[PDB]
Structure formats: structure tokens, C-alpha cells
Design a protein around this ligand. Structure first.
Ligand SMILES: COc1ccc(NC(=O)Nc2ccncc2)cc1
Length: 165
């Protein structure tokens, strides 16, 4: 199971780790992808998870979009986890850099409540432009199921833990 995580709350845990490496080792039931509405996994967590699947995640995602159209900002879909997890929950947090509404971050985290345990990144953090301290706050105040957060950046991880209320 998950190892080396620091307990933040009754249901939220955190570790300084690359979510790709965490997924390959743990093979959780659900890994969350920091997706965009088009499921175009170019960079950030999405690009890294997709590269770990040898692009199988992108091929599956393009078929999903061809059939269903784009997701909503704040929405999600469940697809295969390929070699990383049983499932991948592709969640679209608002991209602040694209002028998307930050208030949609709570809606994005609500998707996690449909899964009893998840390996996840902080939504809307990184290249999505939101303040990761705010993302962690919304996570702890929204998600009720067991969430194991992987924070890639060591310095951000230390700031997140040391500043956690
Ligand atoms: C062998 O090629 C590799 C390429 C990329 C990664 N990981 C990576 O970029 N992870 C990431 C985590 C959080 N935010 C953004 C990115 C690992 C191996």
C-alpha cells in the first residue's frame, strides 16, 4: 500500500513524490490526472502520466473525446489506468493561466468523493496556475474519501506541510 505519507487530516495524506513513480510502485485503484477538457495530455502531471503509458492514455482519451465531446471545467471521467493504476480519474481543475474561474476548484475536488481511495496531485497547481496552498485547503475541506497527495516539488512540499493549518 501507500508508504512514507504524512497524515494531514483524518482522510488526507501527503508525500514529496513524483506521482508517476508513486503510481508505478503502488499501482493504486485510482490515480487522478490533472486533465484539461480536451484530455490533451501534453505537459505537467498529464504529460508525465501519459508518457509513462507509452501514449496509450492519449489514444484512449482521443477515442473518448471523439465519442463524448470535451469535459466541463470542474468535471471528470473515469478511464483506464493502463500500467499505472486500475483506473485513471481525469479531473479538470480550472486553469488560472487560461482565465478560468478559481471557484470551480471545489467542484473539481468533489469528483474525488466518488472513489474510496485515490492517489492524486493538487488540482489546479503547477502549470494550471493556482496557489497550491489554496488547492490543499480546498482539498482538505472538500474531499471526504482517502486522498494520497503526491507533490513533485520538495520546496513546495515543505511549504505546504509547514504552512498547513
Ligand atoms: C522518464 O521520463 C519522465 C518524464 C516525466 C516525469 N515526471 C514528471 O514530469 N512528473 C510531474 C509531476 C508533477 N507535476 C509535473 C510533472 C518522470 C519521468
Amino acid at each position: 500500500s501507500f508508504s512514507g505519507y504524512l497524515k494531514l487530516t483524518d482522510n488526507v495524506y501527503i508525500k514529496n513524490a513524483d506521482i508517476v513513480e508513486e503510481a508505478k510502485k503502488v499501482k493504486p485503484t485510482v490515480v487522478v490526472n490533472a486533465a484539461n477538457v480536451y484530455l490533451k495530455h501534453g505537459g505537467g502531471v498529464a504529460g508525465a502520466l501519459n508518457k509513462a503509458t507509452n501514449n496509450a492514455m492519449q489514444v484512449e482519451s482521443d477515442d473518448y473525446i471523439a465519442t463524448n465531446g470535451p469535459l466541463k471545467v470542474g468535471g471528470s471521467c473515469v478511464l483506464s489506468g493502463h500500467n499505472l493504476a486500475k483506473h485513471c480519474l481525469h479531473v479538470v481543475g480550472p486553469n488560472v493561466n487560461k482565465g478560468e474561474d478559481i471557484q470551480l476548484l471545489k467542484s473539481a475536488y468533489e469528483n474525488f468523493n466518488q472513489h474510496e481511495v485515490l492517489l492524486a496531485p493538487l488540482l489546479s497547481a503547477g502549470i494550471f496556475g493556482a496557489d497550491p496552498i489554496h488547492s490543499l485547503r480546498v482539498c482538505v475541506d472538500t474531499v471526504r474519501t482517502n486522498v494520497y497527495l503526491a507533490v513533485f516539488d520538495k520546496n513546495l512540499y515543505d511549504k505546504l506541510v509547514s504552512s498547513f493549518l
